Design a protein around this ligand. Structure first.
Ligand SMILES: [Zn+2]
Lengths: 225, 717, 23, 81, 687, 62, 232
RNA sequence: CUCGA
C-alpha cells in the first residue's frame, strides 16, 4: 500500500456541464475535496454582472413606462436573469433602444467592446404601438453577490437605479464518491465532481479558477514560522 | 455573552461614542461628534467596538415572573437587527423564538455595572433560586444530541468481539485518538461497545479504588474501560478529575451531574462545562438523524381490534340504557370509564410497537420535549374530548390526527380547545394578582442577622419506617429536608452524633443520617427565628441559587414571593385552594377537628351526623353537629393501622382531623397553637403544588406564613 | 378539475365528494 | 483548575468571592475603587491631591471597573465595613 | 395587510359595541363555541388575545335573512335519499330536524350506505341514527369553517389551537414583489382572491384591444370598450404594497367574470400569501433552536421573500402668533449638502434615496426674541447671524426608515385647496423601501408553525441534496410533534410530489391505493398544482403511494425515498448526513412582523410634559417601561443601585438626567440621583 | 400608609391615614422605590453601603 | 476577481509534539472550506511507519495468555501499537525483540535493523516474570493514515502470526473550529483554529507543512487546466 | 379599538 499520484480527467455532458473524476485518493478523502471545490465554485468564481440601470422616462423602480406591459420593477427582475461577461474589469455601459410594437429581448442590447450577452433570447419587455424603451446598463466585474449600492454611498444621481449584482457564473455544483471498501491491501476513493455553469464560462474554466484559488490559499500552510 | 445589533448599540452608547469620537480627534468638538453619530459616519463603528468593551447590559423578557427574568450579559456587536440570545438562558426567560421581543437596559453608574457583573450575570445564576436545581442546562436539541453518542448499540459496527479461533480480540483500541481514526475511516461506530485504554479521565470511584485507591488516579495513568467512543467524548467535556460515568445520558442524568458540579466544583467551571455541553449537544443533534415523517408515525397494529372491543362494550351499555336499567347520569360515567380504559389500551399498543430507533420515540424518551400522550394522540386516538360544560363527551374522537378527524369529530374537539385557551387568560390574571399580593405581604422581609441563636426548630420526616424493616425515603425530603440547617445534633442508637448542629444539609450529609438509622431531624426554620423585624441567615439555610448560606441583606421575601407566584400559571384543590390558604379563609371543605384528645363517641344516623368525645382527662363531653354528606378520614389510630376509619372507641389525639376535606386554619390555631398551624399551612400549600409537578422548597412558603402570624389581638387593655 | 367556471388555472382536486352548491 | 476566563468572566467570579464577605460587598468594593481610578484619569492633568492611581498595570483602553476588579483579585486593596 | 385580511374583516361578526356587550361584562360562556354555530360562524378563526370568542368570522356558505338570523344551506333528504334540492335553514329551524354529516357514505342514487350514520341533534348531541330519520345533510365538508380556515390544507390533521393561529397568521402575510401560487392548495384560494376585490375581473366578454402596465382596454362583442386602470405601487392602510399587474396580452379572447389582472398576493387569480420553499426537517447546529428558522441566502439574492413597503409622511405650514410657517429651501445653519436633494421649494425630489435624519420638507417657524436661552442669545451674538428669528421645524425621516421617494402631493391654500383654518400649505411624501428578508423577520406556515429567522447561511453552507440543489429552509424537528400539527409534515410530502410529479403503475390494473383517486391524479407533471379540500382531500394511504412513484430528476435519479426522506450532504464539512431526512416543499408566508419595524433603541429624547417621564412607543422615540414586576426582579437580586438608577436619573429626575449626560461626555463619574419629579406631582395632587 | 396606598383600596387607606394623622417612616422597599432612595436590602443596607476602600501601603514605583 | 489580502498563519506551541495553528483572517466562509480538508489531509496523507503484524513465540492457537509475563496477549498488542518508529525503506522490515530473566521489557531493549529508528526507547512493553523469557517478531511497513488489522491478514504467515492495526499516520488527533474576526467594519470574516497532536516522529510544524504541500499539488491538478485569473 | 409574546 504505497502512493500513486492522483489524476484528474474531464468528461463533458453539455456545453455548460462537465464531470471531473479524480483518482486515486485516500479513503474518506474524496468527500472533503469535492466539498472544498464546491464551496469555492459557488462563491468565488469571477464574473460580470449589471450594477445599475437608467431608464429615461423613470426616476425610480416603482413606476411604469407608457406602452410596455411590465413595470420597472418587473423589468429589473427580468434583467436579474441576464448573464454577461466583461473584459474591461471596469465600469462600462450597455445601451438598448427599441420602439414598439414587438418584444424586447436580451439580443436587442448593443454591448460595447469587451462585454457580450450570452442569452439573446431572454424576454425583457412587451411593447405595443405607443411603447418606447430606452435603457442604459452599467456592467462592472466582481465575484459572488453584492447588493444594490446605495445612492448615498455612490456618487450616482437621482436618475440612476441600482440593481443587485449576482457575479457568480456557476449554476449548480455537486459530487459523489465511490469507496473501494473491499478488505484488502488496496483501498481508495474516486471523486466525481459535477459542475454546471451559465454559458458565461465553460465548466473547466470555473474549476481552474477554483483551482488557483485553493492552490494560493493552501499555500499559506506551506510557509514556515 | 449576548449579541445585540450594531445600530442598537450606537444609540444606546451614544454619549459614550460622542466622548470617544472627540478624544481620538475624529470630531473637533462634542457638538459635531453628536452630528457624526446621528449621521452614522463610518468612524463610529470602529469607535463603538472600543466603547462596549466589557460593559454589561441587562436583557429582559416580560412577563418578569422571577428574578432570572432579567439577566446581565456581555454585549457583542453583531450585524442584522435582531438580538442574539444564548440557548441556555431560554428556560429562565421562558422565551421561545416565535416572534418574541426583549428589552435592553444599560447600567451607567459604576455601582450599577458592578451589580450586573456580579449579582445579575447569567453565568453566576445557573441554579433556580426557587428549587436549587439547574436551569442553564441542555434542554431540547442539546439533550437529544448528548443522548445520541452516549447510547450503547449491540450490533453496531466496530464492536468488541471476544477472542475466538485464530483471530484474537477484535475491537480494542490503544488510544481514544485511535478509536477516532477508526470511526473516521468507517470501521468503528461512535455508539459501539469497545475497550479503550484511557489516560486523561479519572476512572469511576468504584474502580479507581481497586486500581490505585491508596493514591488518587493521576493525569497520565492508564486504565481500560468498556464504553463507547461517544461516551468517552462526553466525559471529556466535564472537567478533569471528575469520576467517569458510563451511563446513558438522559436529561435526568445530565441534571444530576450538573447539580453535583454546582455543589462541588466552582461556578466558573460549571458555566464553562455547560457551554461545552451546549456546543457538543448541538453538533450531535445535527447528526442524530432526528426527523419526523409520515412513515415514522407508526399506527397501532391492533387499532381496529381494540376499538371494536370497546365499541362492543359501549353498545352493551347503550343497550343497558335502552331498557332503562341505567340512569342517564350513570350512562355517561359508564361510557367514560370504557373509553378511558380504551385509550389506555391503545397507548400501551403504541409503546411496544414503536421501536427505540424511531425519532418520535427518541425525542420523548430522551427528555427532550413532548409527552407520550401527545404521541398517542398523534398516531393512536385523540380520546374523550371535553365540551364547554366540563365533563367528557360520551363519544370519543376515535380517529387520530395521522388518520384524519371527521367534520363532527373536529367540531366537538374545538369546544374544549377554545375554552382551554379562553380560561388561560383568566387563570393567569388571578395568578399574577395572587403574585403581587404575595409580593407586598413579604416585600420588607430581609436577612438582617447572622444567627438569632434560638435552639427552636421543627421536626422533619427524613424517612418513613417500613413494617418489615430497613427504611423508605420520604417523598418530602427534597422540599422539606434538603438545604436545611440543623438546630439539634442528630443522634442515632449509638452515642455518636452524625452531623453537628448548624451544618448545611448537603447531599452526602443526608445519606449520612439515612445510613445511620435515624429518621427524624430537628432543623432551624424561618418560622422559629426570633428576630425583631427580619430573619436570621442561620434559620433560613442554603440559598438555592447560590448553593451556600444566604448572605445578609438578601431580600428573601421577594424571592420567596416570586418562587411561589411563578408556577401559579398551571393549576386546576387547584388555584382557588391556594387562595383559600394564603388568605386565611374559612375553607370550602370546612372539615371538623378534635378539640380535646380522648375517646370517640360516634352517634351516626341518616338524618344527620353527631359525634361526641369523652375527654381523656377531666373535662366534659363536647358535642358536634355535622352533615352526613361528608366522610371520616382514615386516622392513624393507636393500633398503628393508618386505614382505621373513625368509629366509636378510637383514641384520637388533640387537633386530629375528623372527616375528610380541609380543616379551618382559624380553628387549627385555637387548638394546637401557632407552631402547628404554620406547619399545616406549609404542607397544605405544598400538597397543591406537589400534585402538579412543581417542587418549591418549604423555606419560601414558611417566609409567607411567618408574616401571617406576626400580629396578635387585644383581649384586655 | 377544480373550479372550471371562470377560466382559472387547472388545479386538480383530491375530491371524493361532489360540491352540490357553489360558494 | 479551570479554562482561561474569557471576556467579562475575568477575573473569575469564584476567586473574587474569597477576598470578600458576600456578593453584595464585592459590588461596593469594586465600584468605589473604580470611581477612584476614574477620578485619577480625569484629575491627572489638573489639580493636586489626585486619587491613588491604578495599582496594577492596566491594559490599553481598559475600563476602570475591570482594573479595579483585577486589583481586588490581586489583594492590593483593603476595606472597612 | 393582504387581500385575505380585507375579505375576512368585511365578513367579521363582532359581539362588542353599542347594543351588544361590554368586554368587562362577558363571561366564559359568551365566547366559547355553540352547537348552533355549525355552518354559520367559524369555530376556528378568532383572535387569541382579549377579544377571543367576541370576534368571529362568518362561515363560507352562510348568509343572513332579512330578519337578522344566519341561514346555512342543507340538502333535503326525502326518504333516506339525498336530493339536490337545497334549502337554507335558520338556527331554530335547524334544531327542529336532524342533519347528517357531509362525509356520509351515499349510494349513487342517494341512499345511505349504513343504517346508522353520525348525525347532529339539538343541544349539541352527536350519535348514530337510522337512515330513515335523516331529514337534511351538509352541503360541503368545509361548511362550518371560514374562508381563511378553509384555506389550510390537511386541516383535519391539525389541532384547533394551531389551526386558529394558521388562519389568523394567513391574514398577516405581506404582499411580496412577485407572488407564487402554492403547490399544495385547497381550491378556496381562487374564489377568495376574486371575491376579495383586489384583482381585476372582466365585466363583459371580449378581446383585448390594448394592454399596458397602466391600463387594459377590452373591446366587447357589441362594440363598446371598457378600460380598467391598474393600481400601481399604492400604499395600503398598513403600509403594504398594493400593486396590480396585467395577466392577459394583446388580442386574447377573455370571457366574462375572468381575471384579466391580479393584485397583491395573487398568482393567476389565486391567493399567493407566500412562496414554495425547499424544506428539510432536521436540527442544524442549534441555529434552529425551538421555533428558530434557518434560511438559504438564495432567498435574499433572488428576492424570494423581498417585499415592498410604503410609508406616508406629512407636515403642514400654519399661521403662528409671530407670523406664518413657510416651506422653503433656505434653512438656517444648514449646509448646501444636506439641502442638495431638495428642489427650489424645499421639498425632496422624486427618486432621491433618503436615510433616517434626511430632510423631506424644509419648514421654518418664527420664534420670538423673548423665547431665547441666555446661552442661545450669546451664541447668536458670537456668530453675528442677525435676522435668524426662525427656527428649524423641517420634516425629517424617522429612525428606522429608508427608501426611495416615489411621490409628492402638495396642497396650498393659495391654490384654492381647502385646508383646515389656520393652515397655509400641506405636503405628503411617499417613501417606498425594498425590504429583503432579514435576520429576525417572522415567517410562518399555514398550520400555526411560526418562527423568526435565526440565521441566513450562505448557499454553500446549506445541506444540499444529491444533485447539489441546496434546501431553502431548515425547520427544527423538535417543534413538530408537540404542537400536533402533522399537516405541515403531510404538506411537505405532497409538496415534493407536486414539485417532482408521479406516475402510477398502469400495468396489471390500477393499484389498490389509487382506486379512490380520480383518473386525473394518476399522472402528474413537475410543478403541478393540487387541491386538498378541508375535511376531504388526500388520505395518507394515497400519499404513501405517491411517494413510492415520485418522478425522477433530469438525470433520472429519485432523490427522495418512499418514506419521504432523502440523503443530504453537510455543506460545511462535505460528509453526508448519517441518516435520511424528510425533504419536500412547504408554503411559507412572510408575516407583517419584521425587525425593520420592531427594532428600537433610545439614549434620550422627548419626555411627557406632565410626569416628566420618557415617552412611549417607537413612533414617539420613547424608552422602554421598567414595570412593576421588573422592579421586583431588581429587589430580588439586591441590585439597589441599578434600581435607584432606573427610577431616578434614567427616568424623571429633571436635573439628574442632564448632569448624567454631562458627566458622560465629560468622562466624569455618574452623579448622585435626586428626587423624582413624579413624586413631587403626587404630593401636589394629594394637596 | 405609602406602601399600603399603592397596593389596594387607595381611597380607603388615604382616608384613615389623614384621620389618624399617621406619619410614615420612609424605611421600606416600596417606599424608597417611590421616593428614589436606595432600597434597604442587598447593596443598600448600611453594612455594605457605608464602606471605605483604600489601597494597601504597598504601592508601585510610579 | 478582487484582491483578498492579509491571511496569516501563527503557531502556539502547547507541547513539543502538539501545537495550535490559527489562519486569520479568511474570507467568508473559507474557514470551513479548508477546515475539514486540512484535518483530513493531516490524518490521512502523511507518510509514516508502524507495526503491521507481530508473532509471539509460545503463542500458536490460544491468543489468550502468554506464559512468563503478567500482560496477556491483547495488552502486549496495545503498547506495541503505540510504538513510534520511522523507516527509510519502503518495503516491509522485520525486527526481533528478545529478553530473558525477571525484569522489564522496553522499546529500547529491541534491536532495530539498519534504516529504522525507534523514537521511544523508554516505552514499557512487558513485565518479565521470574525466570521469564519473551521472544517476539515485529513487522514494520510504510503507509499513510489508519488501516484496520483485518486487511493485514495476508501479511501474517500461517504460524502463530497475528495482524495488528497500523497507525501509519504521524499525527494522532486533529480538531478544528471556526470563529469570527473583523478586519475593518464587517465581522463576517472567519478565523480558523487547528489543534494538532502528533507523535515525536515529526513536530506539528512539519506535519502542517507536509499537508500544505500535498494539498497545493492536489488542487494544482485543477489549476493546470487553464490558469485563469482569481484575486489573491 | 386592533394585533404580537
Ligand atoms: Zn432565626
Amino acid at each position: 500500500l504505497i502512493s500513486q499520484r492522483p489524476t484528474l480527467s474531464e468528461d463533458v455532458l453539455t456545453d455548460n456541464r462537465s464531470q471531473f473524476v479524480i483518482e486515486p485518493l485516500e479513503p474518506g478523502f474524496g468527500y472533503t475535496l469535492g466539498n472544498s471545490l464546491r464551496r469555492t465554485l459557488l462563491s468565488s468564481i469571477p464574473g460580470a454582472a449589471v450594477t445599475s440601470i437608467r431608464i429615461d422616462g423613470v426616476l425610480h423602480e416603482f413606476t411604469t413606462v407608457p406602452g410596455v406591459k411590465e413595470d420597472v420593477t418587473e423589468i429589473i427582475l427580468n434583467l436579474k436573469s441576464l448573464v454577461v461577461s466583461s473584459e474591461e474589469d471596469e465600469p462600462v455601459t450597455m445601451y438598448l433602444r427599441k420602439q414598439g410594437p414587438g418584444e424586447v429581448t436580451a439580443g436587442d442590447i448593443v454591448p460595447p467592446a469587451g462585454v457580450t450577452v450570452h442569452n439573446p433570447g431572454m424576454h425583457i419587455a412587451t411593447l405595443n404601438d405607443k411603447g418606447k424603451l430606452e435603457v442604459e446598463l452599467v456592467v462592472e466585474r466582481g465575484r459572488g453577490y453584492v447588493p444594490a449600492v446605495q445612492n448615498r454611498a455612490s456618487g450616482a444621481e437621482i436618475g440612476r437605479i441600482p440593481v443587485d449584482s449576482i457575479y457568480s457564473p456557476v449554476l449548480k455544483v455537486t459530487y459523489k464518491v465511490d469507496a473501494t471498501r473491499v478488505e484488502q491491501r488496496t483501498d481508495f476513493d474516486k471523486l466525481i465532481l459535477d459542475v454546471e455553469t451559465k454559458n458565461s464560462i465553460s465548466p473547466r474554466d470555473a474549476l481552474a479558477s477554483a483551482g488557483k484559488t485553493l492552490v494560493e490559499l493552501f499555500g499559506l500552510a506551506r510557509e514556515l514560522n | 455573552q449576548c449579541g445585540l445589533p450594531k445600530l442598537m448599540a450606537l444609540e444606546l452608547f451614544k454619549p459614550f461614542v460622542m466622548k470617544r469620537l472627540v478624544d481620538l480627534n475624529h470630531a473637533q468638538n462634542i457638538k459635531s461628534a453628536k452630528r457624526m453619530v446621528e449621521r452614522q459616519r463610518p468612524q463610529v463603528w470602529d469607535v463603538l467596538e472600543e466603547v462596549i468593551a466589557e460593559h454589561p447590559v441587562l436583557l429582559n423578557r416580560a412577563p418578569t415572573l422571577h428574578r432570572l427574568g432579567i439577566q446581565a450579559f456581555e454585549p457583542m456587536l453583531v450585524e442584522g437587527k435582531a438580538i442574539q440570545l444564548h440557548p441556555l438562558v431560554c428556560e429562565a426567560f421562558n422565551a421561545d423564538f416565535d416572534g418574541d421581543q426583549m428589552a435592553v437596559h444599560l447600567p451607567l453608574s459604576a455601582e450599577a455595572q458592578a451589580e450586573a457583573r456580579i449579582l445579575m450575570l447569567s453565568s453566576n445564576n445557573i441554579l433556580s433560586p426557587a428549587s436549587g436545581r439547574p436551569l442553564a442546562m441542555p434542554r431540547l436539541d442539546m439533550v437529544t444530541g448528548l443522548y445520541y453518542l452516549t447510547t450503547e448499540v449491540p450490533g453496531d459496527t466496530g464492536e468488541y468481539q471476544p477472542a475466538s479461533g485464530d483471530h484474537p480480540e477484535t475491537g480494542v483500541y490503544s488510544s481514544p485518538a485511535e478509536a477516532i481514526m477508526a470511526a473516521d475511516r468507517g470501521v468503528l461506530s461512535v455508539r459501539a461497545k469497545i475497550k479503550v485504554r484511557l489516560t486523561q479521565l479519572r476512572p469511576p470511584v468504584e474502580i479507581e479504588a481497586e486500581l490505585f485507591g491508596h493514591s488518587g488516579w493521576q493525569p497520565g495513568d492508564a486504565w481500560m474501560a468498556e464504553t463507547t467512543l461517544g461516551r468517552v467524548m462526553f466525559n471529556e467535556l466535564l472537567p478533569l478529575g471528575y469520576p467517569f460515568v458510563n451511563k446513558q445520558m438522559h436529561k435526568k442524568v445530565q441534571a444530576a451531574i450538573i447539580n453535583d458540579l454546582a455543589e462541588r466544583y466552582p461556578m466558573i467551571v460549571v458555566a464553562q462545562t455547560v457551554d461545552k455541553l451546549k456546543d457538543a449537544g448541538f453538533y450531535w443533534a445535527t447528526r442524530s438523524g432526528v426527523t419526523v415523517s409520515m412513515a415514522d408515525v407508526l399506527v397501532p397494529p391492533r387499532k381496529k381490534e381494540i376499538l371494536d372491543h370497546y365499541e362492543e362494550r359501549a353498545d352493551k351499555v347503550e343497550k343497558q340504557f335502552q331498557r332503562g336499567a341505567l340512569n342517564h347520569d350513570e350512562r355517561n360515567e359508564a361510557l367514560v370509564e370504557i373509553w378511558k380504559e380504551a385509550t389506555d389500551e391503545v397507548g400501551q399498543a403504541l409503546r411496544e410497537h414503536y421501536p427505540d430507533d424511531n425519532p418520535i420515540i427518541t425525542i420523548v424518551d430522551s427528555g427532550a420535549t413532548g409527552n407520550f400522550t401527545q404521541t398517542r394522540t398523534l398516531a393512536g386516538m385523540k380520546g374523550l374530548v371535553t365540551n364547554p360544560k366540563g365533563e367528557f363527551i360520551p363519544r370519543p374522537v376515535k380517529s387520530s390526527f395521522r388518520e384524519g378527524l371527521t367534520v363532527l369529530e373536529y367540531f366537538i374537539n374545538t369546544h374544549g380547545a377554545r375554552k382551554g385557551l379562553a380560561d388561560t387568560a383568566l387563570r393567569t390574571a388571578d395568578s399574577g394578582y395572587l403574585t403581587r399580593r404575595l409580593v407586598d405581604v413579604s416585600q420588607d422581609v430581609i436577612v438582617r442577622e447572622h444567627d438569632c441563636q434560638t435552639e427552636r426548630g421543627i421536626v422533619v420526616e427524613l424517612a418513613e419506617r417500613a413494617p418489615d424493616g430497613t427504611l423508605i425515603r420520604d417523598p418530602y425530603i427534597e422540599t422539606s429536608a434538603y438545604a436545611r440547617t440543623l438546630g439539634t445534633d442528630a443522634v442515632d442508637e449509638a452515642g455518636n452524633v452524625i452531623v453537628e448542629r448548624g451544618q448545611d444539609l448537603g447531599d452526602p450529609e443526608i445519606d449520612a443520617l439515612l445510613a445511620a438509622g435515624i429518621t427524624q431531624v430537628k432543623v432551624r426554620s424561618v418560622l422559629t427565628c426570633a428576630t425583631s423585624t427580619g430573619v436570621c441567615a442561620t434559620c433560613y439555610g442554603r440559598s438555592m441559587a447560590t448553593g451556600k448560606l444566604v448572605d445578609i441583606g438578601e431580600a428573601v421575601g421577594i424571592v420567596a414571593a416570586q418562587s411561589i407566584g411563578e408556577p401559579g400559571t398551571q393549576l386546576t384543590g387547584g388555584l382557588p385552594r391556594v387562595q383559600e390558604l394564603f388568605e386565611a379563609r374559612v375553607p370550602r371543605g370546612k372539615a371538623p377537628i378534635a378539640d380535646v384528645t380522648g375517646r370517640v363517641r360516634l352517634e351516626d344516623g341518616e338524618r344527620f351526623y353527631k359525634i361526641t368525645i369523652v375527654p381523656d382527662d377531666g373535662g366534659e363531653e363536647v358535642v358536634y353537629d355535622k352533615i352526613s354528606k361528608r366522610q371520616r378520614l382514615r386516622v392513624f389510630k393507636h393500633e398503628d393501622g393508618s386505614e382505621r376509619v373513625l368509629s366509636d372507641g378510637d383514641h384520637v389525639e388533640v387537633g386530629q382531623q375528623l372527616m375528610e376535606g380541609s380543616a379551618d386554619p382559624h380553628e387549627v390555631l385555637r387548638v394546637q397553637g401557632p407552631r402547628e398551624v404554620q406547619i399545616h399551612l406549609v404542607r397544605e400549600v405544598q400538597e397543591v403544588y406537589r400534585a402538579q409537578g412543581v417542587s418549591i422548597h418549604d423555606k419560601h412558603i414558611e417566609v409567607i406564613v411567618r408574616q401571617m402570624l406576626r400580629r396578635v389581638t387585644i383581649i384586655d387593655s | 378539475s377544480n373550479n372550471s367556471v371562470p377560466g382559472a388555472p387547472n388545479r386538480v382536486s383530491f375530491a371524493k365528494l361532489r360540491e352540490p352548491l357553489e360558494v | 483548575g479551570y479554562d482561561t476566563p474569557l471576556g467579562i468572566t475575568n477575573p473569575p467570579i469564584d476567586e473574587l468571592l474569597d477576598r470578600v464577605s458576600s456578593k453584595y460587598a464585592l459590588v461596593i468594593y469594586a465600584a468605589k475603587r473604580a470611581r477612584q481610578i476614574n477620578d485619577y484619569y480625569n484629575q491627572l492633568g489638573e489639580g493636586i491631591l489626585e486619587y491613588v492611581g491604578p495599582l496594577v498595570e492596566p491594559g490599553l483602553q481598559e475600563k476602570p471597573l475591570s482594573i479595579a476588579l483585577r486589583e481586588i483579585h490581586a489583594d492590593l486593596l483593603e476595606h472597612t465595613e | 395587510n393582504n387581500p385575505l385580511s380585507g375579505l375576512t374583516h368585511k365578513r367579521r361578526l363582532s359581539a362588542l359595541g353599542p347594543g351588544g356587550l361590554s368586554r368587562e361584562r362577558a363571561g366564559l360562556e359568551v365566547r366559547d363555541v355553540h352547537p348552533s354555530h355549525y355552518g354559520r360562524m367559524c369555530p376556528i378563526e378568532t383572535p387569541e388575545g382579549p377579544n377571543i370568542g367576541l370576534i368571529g368570522s362568518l362561515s363560507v356558505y352562510a348568509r343572513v335573512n332579512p330578519f337578522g338570523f344566519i341561514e346555512t344551506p342543507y340538502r333535503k333528504v326525502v326518504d333516506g335519499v339525498v336530493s339536490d334540492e337545497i334549502v337554507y335553514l335558520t338556527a331554530d329551524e335547524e334544531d327542529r330536524h336532524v342533519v347528517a354529516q357531509a362525509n356520509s357514505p351515499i349510494d349513487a342514487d342517494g341512499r345511505f350506505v349504513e343504517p346508522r350514520v353520525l348525525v347532529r341533534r339539538k343541544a349539541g348531541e352527536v350519535e348514530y341514527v337510522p337512515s330513515s330519520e335523516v331529514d337534511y345533510m351538509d352541503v360541503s365538508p368545509r361548511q362550518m369553517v371560514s374562508v381563511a380556515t378553509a384555506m389550510i390544507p390537511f386541516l383535519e390533521h391539525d389541532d384547533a389551537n394551531r389551526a386558529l393561529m394558521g388562519a389568523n397568521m394567513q391574514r398577516q402575510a405581506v404582499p411580496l414583489v412577485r407572488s407564487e401560487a402554492p403547490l399544495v392548495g385547497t381550491g378556496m384560494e381562487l374564489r377568495a382572491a376574486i371575491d376579495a376585490g383586489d384583482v381585476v375581473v372582466a365585466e363583459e366578454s371580449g378581446v383585448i384591444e390594448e394592454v399596458s402596465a397602466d391600463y387594459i382596454t377590452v373591446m366587447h362583442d357589441n362594440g363598446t370598450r371598457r378600460t380598467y386602470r391598474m393600481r400601481k405601487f399604492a400604499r395600503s392602510n398598513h403600509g403594504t404594497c398594493a400593486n396590480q399587474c396585467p395577466i392577459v396580452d394583446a388580442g386574447d379572447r377573455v370571457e366574462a367574470g375572468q381575471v384579466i389582472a391580479d393584485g397583491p398576493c395573487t398568482d393567476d387569480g389565486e391567493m399567493a400569501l407566500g412562496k414554495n420553499l425547499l424544506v428539510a426537517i432536521m436540527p442544524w447546529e442549534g441555529h434552529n433552536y425551538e421555533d428558530a428558522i434557518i434560511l438559504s441566502n438564495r432567498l435574499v439574492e433572488e428576492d424570494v421573500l423581498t417585499s415592498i413597503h410604503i410609508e406616508e409622511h406629512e407636515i403642514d405650514a400654519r399661521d403662528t402668533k409671530l407670523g406664518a410657517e413657510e416651506i422653503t429651501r433656505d434653512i438656517p445653519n444648514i449646509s448646501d449638502e444636506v439641502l442638495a436633494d431638495l428642489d427650489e421649494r424645499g421639498i425632496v425630489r422624486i427618486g432621491a434615496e433618503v436615510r433616517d435624519g434626511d430632510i423631506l420638507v424644509g419648514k421654518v417657524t418664527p420664534k420670538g426674541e423673548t423665547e431665547l436661552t441666555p446661552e442661545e442669545r450669546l451664541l447668536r451674538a458670537i456668530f453675528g447671524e442677525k435676522a435668524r428669528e426662525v427656527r428649524d421645524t423641517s420634516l425629517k425621516v424617522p429612525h428606522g426608515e429608508s427608501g426611495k421617494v416615489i411621490g409628492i402631493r402638495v396642497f396650498s391654500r393659495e391654490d384654492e385647496d381647502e385646508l383646515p383654518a389656520g393652515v397655509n400649505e400641506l405636503v405628503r411624501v411617499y417613501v417606498a423601501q425594498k425590504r429583503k428578508i432579514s435576520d429576525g423577520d417572522k415567517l410562518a406556515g399555514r398550520h400555526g408553525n411560526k418562527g423568526v429567522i435565526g440565521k441566513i447561511l450562505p448557499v454553500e453552507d446549506m445541506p444540499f441534496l444529491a444533485d447539489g440543489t441546496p434546501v431553502d429552509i431548515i425547520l427544527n424537528t423538535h417543534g413538530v410533534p408537540r404542537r400536533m400539527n402533522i399537516g405541515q409534515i403531510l404538506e411537505t410530502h405532497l409538496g415534493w410530489c407536486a414539485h417532482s410529479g408521479w406516475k402510477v403503475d398502469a400495468a396489471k390494473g390500477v393499484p389498490d391505493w389509487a382506486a379512490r383517486l380520480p383518473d386525473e391524479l394518476l399522472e402528474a407533471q413537475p410543478n403541478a398544482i393540487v387541491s386538498t379540500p378541508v375535511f376531504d382531500g388526500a388520505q395518507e394511504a394515497e400519499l404513501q403511494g405517491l411517494l413510492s412513484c415520485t418522478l425522477p430528476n433530469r438525470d433520472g435519479d429519485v432523490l427522495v425515498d418512499a418514506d419521504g426522506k432523502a440523503m443530504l450532504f453537510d455543506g460545511r464539512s462535505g460528509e453526508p448526513f448519517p441518516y435520511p431526512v424528510t425533504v419536500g416543499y412547504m408554503y411559507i408566508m412572510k408575516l407583517h412582523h419584521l425587525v425593520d419595524d420592531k427594532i428600537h433603541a433610545r439614549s434620550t429624547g422627548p419626555y411627557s410634559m406632565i410626569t416628566q417621564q420618557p415617552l412611549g412607543g417607537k413612533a414617539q422615540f420613547g424608552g422602554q417601561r421598567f414595570g412593576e414586576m421588573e422592579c421586583w426582579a431588581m429587589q430580588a437580586y439586591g441590585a439597589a443601585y441599578t434600581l435607584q438608577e432606573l427610577l431616578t436619573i434614567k427616568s424623571d429626575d429633571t436635573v439628574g438626567r442632564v448632569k448624567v449626560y454631562e458627566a458622560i461626555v465629560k468622562g466624569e463619574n455618574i452623579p448622585e440621583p435626586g428626587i423624582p419629579e413624579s413624586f413631587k406631582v403626587l404630593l401636589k395632587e394629594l394637596q | 400608609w405609602l406602601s399600603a396606598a399603592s397596593f389596594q383600596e387607595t381611597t380607603r387607606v388615604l382616608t384613615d391615614a389623614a384621620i389618624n394623622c399617621r406619619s410614615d417612616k420612609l424605611n421600606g422597599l416600596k417606599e424608597n422605590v417611590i421616593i428614589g432612595k436606595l432600597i434597604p436590602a442587598g447593596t443598600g443596607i448600611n453594612r455594605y453601603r457605608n464602606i471605605a476602600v483604600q489601597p494597601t501601603e504597598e504601592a508601585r514605583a510610579a
